[PDB]
């Protein structure tokens, strides 16, 4: 017994390419289409629920996940990846920063700590990269609201508004064009929705969309009263409903 | 360069062939199961095929259980079957005790789906060739279906198949849904519930049941058990008249 | 315990150190040297626990030579001292600690001052015109609080130890077999082989 | 590709048969066990003729009963000796008494075969084995003057006379002729000197070989160049008689 | 073929085989013959010492585990030392903690178990000798013969390394006549000389180069050399 | 592409292991190796192959007990079957330790189970080279089990393993339809007797040695123990007259 | 956990990567070192592949393990940082618990070992570096100089280099260096060194360096200038011929 | 509190004659004012003409005397059968006892 | 076993040269150029950034240019993820050093220690080298201004003006073309910006694919002061020096 696989499994190739990070890289641009528009005011992240069958309860499976009540990811590539670094993600939230600071980490910080992660299953002995690339999309008080992205690679960036997976080269255009610095959070969600139309094939509704938002605090979603400095949660996840009534106006 | 075959790196086109020669695993032993939800109950019905003379008949199942709730259903290698029946109790055990209540179906699966992600990314160990089925009546969900892969993947389901022949069963059920406009069997005894589910298993697989072809499992409030031959045979009888 | 006396002046740094070890009933040695170099132009005198005392100086000084070595330059007085603190301060919560008091006088070839740092097993270090470890200190810290003048030569730094060294010989219980005293200066650690009768 | 420790279809270890092939390649050494004392020599070989010749290492002391020469990778050796040198002390320090030559050689012997990459038996941590042999000789009470031929093999054996090295095969066929339960020390002395002067590649002289020897009256003693000089000419003169 | 399922112990071969081992027991049948046998009272190892050259001793080959339990060896001499100091330790420890001689059957099954640890395992080798233990215990005189494979087994008599079939088949003959030499140790050695002669060709066993060894009723494990085998030349 | 057979927790395209499989082979080369369960007890019997003369009859034992209560043999390299027996004997020791009554048959057969399948996880262990026939007696009772090297493992009504696997499976098929009640712990005995001297035509170039054990909870009071003597040579006459 | 084994055997009885550890030294700049009646010399030379360097700080070839001896090399320049390293504190430790410096042949007899251990241990590969270290033991005045390599093994010369074209430099050595009258002067002895360098260096004022070592820690580098005119002197020397 | 350590009385005398010697002591082993036997032998023959006795806390004294018997015969195994000298055996005995210098055999020992 | 998957990161090819280290060094340069010029009273850093898009959001953005410590700053070419590994523990060692001994590191010991550590990866641990090349801007009172570069081997050397990344050899002649000692800070800024503008791969030259920084004494101080450049001030910069 015993991992005796305490070599790196990702090495360099003599054109100096790392193999792994490329098919990781490869294996993301099959996953599920997602993206992410920021706006003045919020943002916002959307994939779309590929129900494997009819019979599985959609709901039941989440690929946009809050992390902290300011932080919420999205992904493209490998589920079972994505669903084990959320809660890598959730955790060191707290250890490496929560417990020390009395604080949650702020957006770029967070999204550093699992690139990190990310970066280690790269040059750590017997793994291979996660097959995955996520949008994280978050506010804390000195720099208000972002969007990264995070690669297999381990490596980040922040954007205005891009996306990721299957048809993301079609989709970054559609992107470039409709956004500017002015807009408000609404629009985004608008052009969100947009954008995402073109990648869907079948069915387009609020319950083949998973889509959520990073924008005021949601005293409502807090739990308690009596805090002033408490004003509950700045990401909420958006109702199948609530989905609908903006497609209306599409 | 060959060797992206045989541990759980990436294929160049990014893939993990491990990953799914282990899925075909799954379908060794050529049995076929379906799980569905009852008003108030979750009924899982399975194969159930003795070759051998020799074999003490009793001791032929791929249904366990896990806790006194939660009941699981194993596609796949008996060997890698019971591997992962004995962790499943082991995390549904001392759940109890770290969180003072009983596990859910929907956390244990998510859990299992978890350690499976893991032998998809570490190199030295291997994914286990079975797919769970995870059932019973959670305290706040209600009925659950929730099922795991090889590739750690996992899902609830208003109802399920799995086996050699998944597709058949699975748009057999599809159909009578779609009929139905709702997402469960509306009957009242759980009894009906294993009928209908051993009907619909008929259906699909063109096939005629005797008590000893079948393995049936029940999940209740508050608990999950098996039939035994006689329960299953009243069961037989009862969907006898009536076709 | 021994005496572990210094004095800051002008140009150097003057280290007083008793002689005497003294072990249960008899007195071992009369000519202890109390001191050891850890460069050029840094030395450290040490009092305390019998065996911790030169094993932490040796051990320090050790590391600064290597130090020396490794990148060829010497390290400020006021960097070894900070250096010497933090090993105190280590030992100081381990299993067995180290029982040592130091006085480190050095003189800073690129402030070109002299400098004098006092600190004691604790970890509690202090930078002083004189200082002084134990009960020294109360024998001598009235003289040297009237007698102390920031200006003082190197040769009124020596008198008004050797006025000190009298006054602990004179009221202090224990005959420590008088001192050996050093100058550290921008030319280096010199002894003052003349103080029995100077 | 394949394990340090794997056997070959014939029941040989690779990575100890490989080992034995490195030795070969080393400079020639010989050991004569007469009733008056081991002799020990060695080819020095230089590989400049600006390399001081008697920095050249290869008859080392173990104990003043006990003594040894090398063959092929020298610095392999090192740790031998050490290792060596330290159950030597460390038993006389537990029995005040001499280690016996034959446990001093078994406990070297010992380490041997301690390499792999995990090896189930312990822990052998040891890349690969030792690419040297050594001639192990000495006296002790028991069973008097010894010689010793220790393998990376783990095993060892005694001899009356052997020699490892270059000129290995062909120097021993020469031993086998020579060596007489009645030898003196003077004759193995010249003897070894002989053959040692047959084998090697240059021109036998105080300065490429040396000689040592051990007894129990002295023990054991490196000659100095100026006494091996002087052996060479004895040598020349009873040579040149016939 | 073989060439991809021999690489390591770990591996089986697609009939099922595990070439390293048999790798090993090969390095057995290159090592120099030894005999073991025994009547009711007595089991004698007479083991052929080998040389390296006209100038080499003739490496031993029996080793004393005990005062009732001793075993000879075939092959490689360091695996031999490893074992036999593992079977020193289990008599040792049976001695000490329970105050009972270890039963020569049971030291089979230790040397057994500890020779298949060695099979299962990445990274480690099959021991590559073969032993041949006698003993006289609570049960009377045993005879045990030990393979790398980890395979023991209980023989009235027997013979391993070079040759070794030669003796074995003296003995499969011999049988009868020896399995009685009760209370006549003389005969049991000379007979054990009869058999290992059974597998000579090269020379002819002498003085310093034979070795036998002893156990039995009232004879406690013991190793004779040289002069002390004389006469049985 | 190939090699999927080269290292041990390998899945090949069409889901096999086939260290495991090369395993099989191994047990199938060996001995053959029986278990009766009756109407309360178990019975186990082995082939013994006698390679010469020099053999000591009736010393080589291959049956093995785990605790006082459970009956193990199995077919293959022997050695693998005695580890498998001393990781037995330890769960065992451990359970009783823990709760006091003695390790019940099916949990005893997990613990084995549980312990061979972990040797098809790595491709750093080797899978066990043999078939295990074991059982016994417990609380509600009498159990009959055989484990395959892929850890695999059922309850068995009668069992068999080895060279002559397939003599006896037929032998056995027999006697489980001609006896729908149970056949007796006494019955079983001389049954198993012949079973193995049937099952040994497979192997007739070489003499043998017969060896049987039993479990019953009224012949033996729930303990195993080895038939020896008279029993045993009376079942030995049986087979010996039944072989003709 | 990494422990493969990277040195091993192969069949002629070679230990490849110790081997190719030393075809490393090969392509390292050269160096050479020459002992004297009262003192020792040790030249470097200067690559050139890339000239805009920094001289004052861009780490130089010969470093001081102690007061009293230095050590110089070719090869991996990464792997000569940790045998230094290595070395300069086994000399204040040998200092402290012997209260006496350390000889040359022990320091030397130190990295050898280092260097040995690293051939036959596991998930390491051997260094690829060999060395010249020289200087005087305390309280002599005998000089002092020795070498290693990969494989781990050492000794002592009267004039020795290694690295790249050492073969040619050696040979001009060798029929140079007169043991019967090594170098009586410090001067003598730096140039009997610039020569040897200058059968390779090919005209390199700036690509070459002397480092002296005198008895009792007497340690000092030449400049440039002070070199310039011992190579200015040589290439009289042969035009007046 | 659990004391580790007891007295179980008992005297020895060792004598050295000049081509002999002689190592006696009385046979009552005692604990407080009880007797536990009036004959439990303290003196011992451990080989190679070896006669060694360890009196004071019989538990320790046993332990000793057991551990030394025990270091002869490996002695045998390691060297070749060799005889232990009495010198050998002494320095031998004064590891065995400095061993547990924390934790001391509590006995006055004589070979 | 395992070791056949070992691809042996840390082996010597036949000429004595380590494979890894090569291919990383490979990778290396296809990294956004970097360009480091000392000047008498300054350092420039200056950086191209790799692959950018309108929607890249810059003011938020650094890959190129990271604070180590107050006085030291590195330029990055190559795996910035590998980077932030580095670069963190120089953080930290650059703390130790100054909380050991009340004085800020000099900026040599923490090249040294950060280079040391990547030598390790090429020694031993099967793991990969770090795709990472580094230029060290920085400032001690020992030696002043100083500029460093280290690349995946380990090995470190000090410079008036250097370059990593692509192009490596094309701007280290312009450099080695246009460099003066007697430079001036804003003499380099120009320098550095020219080179980069003649080796890129891309168009033109915007201030949205760079990254500037300088380390200037600040005459009205007498103390260092580090300056990462905000994308207006490049922008500014920019025109200035003319490339509009």
Same mark, same amino acid.
């Given at each position: ?21 490329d ?67 959730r ?7 929560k ?18 992660i ?5 040059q ?127 | ?12 086109e990014?893939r ?92 244990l ?65 599809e ?11 509306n ?57 | ?56 100086a ?40 180290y ?21 004691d ?35 009124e ?42 | ?5 794997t ?17 070969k ?41 006990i ?16 290792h ?12 005040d ?5 034959? &446990? *001093? /050689?078994?406990?070297?012997?010992? $380490? ?9 038996? @312990? !822990?052998? %941590?040891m ?32 001899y ?21 339960? &009645? *030898? /003196?020390?003077?004759?193995?002395? $010249? ?9 090697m @590649? !240059?021109? %036998? ?38 | ?64 585990c ?11 001499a ?50 590559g ?49 020896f399995?009685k ?13 009869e ?6 060709r ?28 004389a006469?049985?030349? | 592409g ?5 290292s ?32 309360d ?50 769960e ?32 750093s ?40 696997r ?25 049954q ?13 170039e ?39 | ?20 550890a ?37 780490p ?77 033991d305390?309280?002599?005045d ?100 | ?9 008992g005297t ?25 036997s ?16 360890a ?7 046993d ?28 320095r031998?005995?004064?590891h ?16 | ?30 990294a ?6 000392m ?11 790799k ?10 953005s ?16 190559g ?6 590994i ?5 953080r ?18 923490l ?11 090429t ?62 800070v ?48 490049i ?10």
């Amino acid at each position: 017994m015993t991992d005796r696989y305490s070599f790196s499994l990702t090495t360099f190739s003599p054109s100096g390419k790392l193999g792994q990070i490329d098919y990781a890289l490869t294996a993301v641009k099959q996953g599920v289409t997602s993206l992410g528009i920021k706006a003045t005011n919020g943002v916002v992240i959307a994939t779309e629920k590929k129900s494997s069958s009819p019979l599985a309860m959609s709901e039941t499976l989440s690929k946009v996940s809050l992390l902290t009540p300011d932080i919420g990811a999205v992904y493209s590539g490998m589920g079972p990846d994505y669903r084990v670094l959320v809660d890598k993600s959730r955790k060191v939230a707290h250890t490496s920063y929560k417990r020390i600071y009395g604080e949650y980490p702020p957006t770029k910080l967070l999204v550093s700590e699992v690139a990190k992660i990310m970066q280690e299953a790269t040059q750590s002995g017997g793994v291979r990269p996660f097959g995955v690339s996520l949008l994280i999309a978050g506010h804390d008080e000195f720099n208000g609201f972002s969007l990264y992205q995070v690669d297999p690679s381990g490596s980040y960036f922040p954007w205005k508004a891009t996306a990721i997976g299957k048809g993301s080269v079609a989709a970054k255009t559609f992107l470039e064009k409709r956004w500017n610095d002015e807009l408000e959070l609404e629009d985004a969600i608008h052009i969100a929705l947009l954008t995402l139309k073109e990648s869907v094939e079948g069915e387009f509704n609020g319950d083949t969309i998973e889509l959520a938002i990073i924008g005021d605090e949601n005293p409502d979603l807090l739990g308690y009263t009596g805090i002033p400095t408490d004003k509950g949660p700045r990401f909420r996840k958006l109702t199948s409903q609530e989905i609908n009534d903006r497609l209306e106006a599409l | 360069a060959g060797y992206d075959r045989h541990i759980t790196i990436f294929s160049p086109e990014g893939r993990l062939y491990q990953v799914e020669y282990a899925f075909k695993a799954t379908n060794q032993t050529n049995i076929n199961s379906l799980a569905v939800r009852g008003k108030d109950c979750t009924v899982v019905i399975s194969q159930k095929k003795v070759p051998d003379k020799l074999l003490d008949p009793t001791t032929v199942s791929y249904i366990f259980c896990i806790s006194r709730t939660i009941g699981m259903v194993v596609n796949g290698p008996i060997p890698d079957a019971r591997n992962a029946a004995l962790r499943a109790k082991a995390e549904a055990a001392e759940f109890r005790y770290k969180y003072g209540y009983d596990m859910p179906c929907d956390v244990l699966a998510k859990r299992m789906a978890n350690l499976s992600q893991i032998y998809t990314q570490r190199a030295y160990m291997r994914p286990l060739g079975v797919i769970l089925t995870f059932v019973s009546v959670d305290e706040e969900l209600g009925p659950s279906i929730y099922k795991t892969d090889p590739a750690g993947y996992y899902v609830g389901y208003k109802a399920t198949a799995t086996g050699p022949k998944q597709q058949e069963i699975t748009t057999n059920l599809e159909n009578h849904f779609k009929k139905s406009k709702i997402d469960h069997i509306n009957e009242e005894s759980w009894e009906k519930v294993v009928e209908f589910a051993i009907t619909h298993m008929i259906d699909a697989l063109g096939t005629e049941f005797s008590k000893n072809d079948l393995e049936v499992g029940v999940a209740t409030k508050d608990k999950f058990f098996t039939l035994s031959a006689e329960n299953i045979e009243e069961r037989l009888v009862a969907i006898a008249e009536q076709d | 315990m021994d005496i572990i006396l210094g004095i800051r002046v002008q140009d150097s740094v003057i280290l007083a150190s008793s002689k005497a070890v003294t072990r249960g009933i008899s007195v071992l040695k009369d000519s202890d040297d109390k001191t050891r170099q850890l460069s050029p132009h840094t030395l450290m005198s040490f009092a305390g626990e019998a065996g911790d005392t030169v094993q932490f100086a040796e051990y320090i000084q050790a590391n600064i030579q290597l130090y020396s070595i490794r990148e060829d330059y010497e390290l400020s007085p006021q960097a070894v001292s900070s250096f010497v603190r933090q090993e105190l301060a280590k030992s100081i919560r381990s299993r067995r600690p180290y029982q040592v008091n130091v006085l480190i006088g050095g003189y800073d070839k690129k402030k070109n001052k002299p400098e004098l740092y006092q600190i004691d097993y604790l970890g509690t270090k202090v930078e002083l015109p004189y200082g002084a470890h134990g009960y020294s200190g109360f024998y001598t810290f009235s003289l040297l609080d009237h007698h102390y003048r920031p200006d003082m030569t190197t040769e009124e730094g020596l008198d008004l130890l050797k006025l000190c060294v009298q006054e602990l010989e004179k009221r202090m219980p224990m005959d420590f077999k008088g001192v050996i005293v050093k100058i550290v200066d921008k030319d280096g650690i010199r002894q003052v082989d003349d103080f029995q009768a100077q | 590709d394949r394990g340090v420790s794997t056997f070959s279809p014939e029941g040989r270890l690779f990575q100890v048969e490989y080992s034995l092939e490195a030795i070969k390649l080393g400079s020639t050494a010989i050991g004569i066990a007469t009733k008056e004392g081991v002799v020990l020599g060695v080819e020095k070989r230089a590989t400049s003729p600006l390399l001081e010749s008697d920095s050249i290492e290869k008859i080392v002391e173990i104990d003043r009963h006990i003594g040894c020469a090398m063959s092929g990778l020298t610095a392999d050796a090192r740790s031998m000796i050490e290792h060596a040198r330290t159950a030597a002390v460390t038993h006389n320090l537990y029995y005040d008494e001499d280690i016996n030559v034959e &446990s *001093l /050689t078994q406990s070297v012997c010992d $380490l041997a075969l301690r390499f792999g990459e995990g090896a189930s038996g @312990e !822990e052998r %941590l040891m890349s690969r084995p030792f690419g040297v042999a050594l001639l192990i000789a000495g006296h002790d009470a028991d069973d008097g003057y010894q010689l010793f031929h220790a393998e990376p093999s783990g095993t060892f054996y005694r001899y009356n006379a052997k020699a490892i090295g270059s000129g290995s095969e062909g120097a021993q066929a020469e031993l086998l002729n020579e060596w007489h339960s &009645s *030898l /003196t020390l003077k004759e193995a002395e $010249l003897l070894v000197l002989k053959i040692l002067k047959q084998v090697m @590649e !240059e021109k %036998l002289d105080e300065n490429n070989a040396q000689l040592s020897c051990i007894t129990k009256q002295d023990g054991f003693k490196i000659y100095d160049n100026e006494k091996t000089a002087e052996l060479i000419k004895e040598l020349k003169e009873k040579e040149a008689a016939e | 073929f073989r060439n991809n399922y021999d690489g390591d112990t770990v591996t089986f071969s697609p009939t099922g085989r595990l070439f390293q081992v048999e790798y090993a027991l090969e390095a057995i049948k290159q090592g120099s013959v030894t005999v073991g046998l025994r009547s009711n009272t007595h089991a004698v190892l007479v083991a052929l010492k080998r040389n390296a050259d006209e100038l080499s001793s003739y490496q031993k080959k029996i080793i004393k585990c005990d005062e009732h339990m001793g075993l000879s060896l075939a092959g490689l001499a360091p695996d031999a030392r490893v074992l036999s100091n593992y079977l020193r330790q289990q008599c040792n420890y049976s001695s000490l903690v329970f105050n009972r001689k270890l039963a020569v059957e049971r030291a089979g099954h230790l040397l057994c178990d500890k020779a298949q640890k060695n099979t299962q395992s990445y990274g480690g080798r099959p021991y590559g000798v073969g032993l041949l233990i006698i003993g006289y215990d609570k049960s009377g005189a045993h005879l045990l013969e030990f393979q790398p494979s980890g395979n023991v087994t209980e023989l009235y008599g027997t013979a391993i390394g070079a040759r070794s079939q030669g003796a074995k088949t003296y003995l499969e003959r011999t049988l009868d006549t020896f399995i009685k030499i009760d209370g006549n140790p003389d005969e049991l050695i000379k007979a054990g000389v009869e058999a290992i002669s059974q597998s000579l060709r090269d020379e002819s066993l002498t003085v310093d180069n034979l070795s036998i060894a002893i156990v039995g009723k009232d004879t406690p494990f013991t190793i004779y050399d040289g002069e002390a085998v004389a006469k049985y030349i | 592409g190939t090699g999927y057979d080269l290292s041990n927790s390998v899945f090949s395209p069409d889901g096999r292991n086939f260290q495991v499989e090369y395993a099989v082979k191994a047990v199938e080369n060996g001995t053959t190796s029986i278990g009766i369960k009756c109407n309360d007890g178990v019975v186990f019997a082995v082939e013994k192959l006698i390679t010469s003369k020099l053999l000591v009859p009736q010393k080589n034992v291959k049956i093995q007990v785990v605790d006082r209560h459970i009956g193990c043999v199995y077919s293959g390299l022997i050695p693998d079957g005695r580890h498998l027996v001393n990781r037995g004997r330890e769960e065992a020791a451990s359970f009783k330790k823990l709760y006091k009554t003695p390790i019940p048959i099916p949990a005893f057969a997990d613990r084995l189970g549980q312990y061979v399948q972990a040797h098809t996880l790595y491709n750093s262990v080797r899978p066990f080279g043999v078939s295990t026939i074991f059982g016994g007696v417990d609380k509600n009772g009498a159990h009959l089990y055989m484990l395959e090297p892929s850890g695999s493992y059922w309850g068995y009504k009668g069992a068999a393993t080895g060279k002559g696997r397939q003599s006896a499976k037929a032998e056995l098929e027999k006697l489980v339809d001609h006896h729908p009640e149970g056949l007796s712990a006494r019955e079983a005995v001389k049954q198993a007797a012949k079973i193995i001297y049937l099952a040994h035509e497979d192997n007739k170039e070489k003499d043998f040695e017969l060896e049987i054990s039993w479990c019953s909870l009224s012949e033996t009071n729930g303990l195993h123990k080895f038939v020896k003597g008279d029993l045993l040579q009376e079942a030995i006459d049986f087979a010996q007259k039944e072989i003709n | 956990g990494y422990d493969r084994a990277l040195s091993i055997f192969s069949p002629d009885g070679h230990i490849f990567q110790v081997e190719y550890a030393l075809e490393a030294v090969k392509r390292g700049t050269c160096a050479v070192g020459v002992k004297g009646k009262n003192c020792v010399v040790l030249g470097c030379e200067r690559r050139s592949t890339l000239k805009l360097q920094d001289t004052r700080i861009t780490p130089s070839k010969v470093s001081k393990i102690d007061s009293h001896v230095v050590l110089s090399f070719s090869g991996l320049n990464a792997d000569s940082r940790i045998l230094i390293e290595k070395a300069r504190v086994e000399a204040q430790s040998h200092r402290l618990t012997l209260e006496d410096p350390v000889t040359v042949e022990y320091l030397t007899r130190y990295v050898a070992g280092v260097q040995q251990r690293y051939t036959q241990s596991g998930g390491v590969r051997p260094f690829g570096v060999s060395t010249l270290i020289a200087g005087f033991d305390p309280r002599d005045d005998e000089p002092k100089l020795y070498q290693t390599e990969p494989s781990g093994i050492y000794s002592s010369w009267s004039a020795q280099t290694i690295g790249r074209n050492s073969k040619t430099v050696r040979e001009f050595l060798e029929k140079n260096y007169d043991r019967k009258e090594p170098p009586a002067t410090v001067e003598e002895c730096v140039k009997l060194t610039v020569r040897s360098l200058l059968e390779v260096v090919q005209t390199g004022a700036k690509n070459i360096e002397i480092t002296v070592v005198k008895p009792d820690s007497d340690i000092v580098a030449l400049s440039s200038e002070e070199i310039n005119q011992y190579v200015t002197q040589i290439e009289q020397e042969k035009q007046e011929q | 509190q659990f004391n580790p350590y007891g007295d179980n009385g008992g005297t020895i005398l060792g004598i050295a004659g000049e081509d002999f010697a002689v190592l006696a002591g009385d046979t009552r082993n005692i604990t407080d004012y009880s007797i536990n036997s009036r004959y439990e032998p303290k003196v011992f023959d451990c080989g190679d003409n070896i006669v060694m006795s360890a009196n004071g806390f019989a538990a320790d004294g046993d332990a000793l005397v057991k551990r030394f018997k025990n270091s002869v015969k490996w002695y045998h195994f390691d060297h070749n059968d060799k005889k232990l000298s009495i010198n050998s055996a002494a320095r031998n005995i004064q590891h065995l006892l400095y061993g547990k210098r924390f934790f001391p055999y509590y006995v006055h020992t004589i070979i | 076993g395992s070791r056949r998957y070992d691809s042996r990161t840390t082996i010597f090819s036949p000429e004595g040269r380590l494979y890894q280290v090569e291919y990383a060094l490979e990778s290396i340069s296809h990294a956004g150029t970097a360009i480091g010029i000392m000047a008498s009273d300054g350092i420039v850093l200056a950086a191209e950034r790799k692959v950018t898009s309108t929607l890249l959001e810059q003011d938020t953005s650094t890959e190129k240019l990271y604070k180590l410590n107050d006085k030291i700053a590195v330029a990055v070419a190559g795996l910035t993820a590998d980077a932030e590994i580095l670069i963190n523990t120089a953080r930290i060692h650059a703390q130790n050093y100054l909380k050991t001994y009340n004085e800020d590191i000099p900026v040599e010991i923490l090249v040294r220690r950060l280079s040391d550590i990547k030598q390790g990866y090429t020694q031993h641990g099967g793991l990969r080298p770090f795709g990472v090349s580094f230029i060290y801007a920085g400032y001690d009172d020992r030696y002043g201004y100083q500029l460093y570069t280290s690349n995946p081997s380990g090995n470190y050397t000090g410079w008036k003006a250097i370059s990593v990344g692509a192009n490596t050899s094309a701007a280290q002649t312009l450099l080695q073309m246009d460099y003066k000692d007697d430079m001036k800070v804003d003499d380099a800024i120009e320098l550095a910006l020219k080179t980069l503008s003649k080796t890129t791969d891309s168009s033109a030259l915007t201030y949205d694919r760079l990254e500037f920084a300088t380390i200037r004494k600040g005459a009205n101080d007498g103390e260092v002061y580090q300056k990462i450049f905000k994308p207006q001030e490049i922008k500014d910069i920019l025109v200035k020096t003319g490339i509009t």
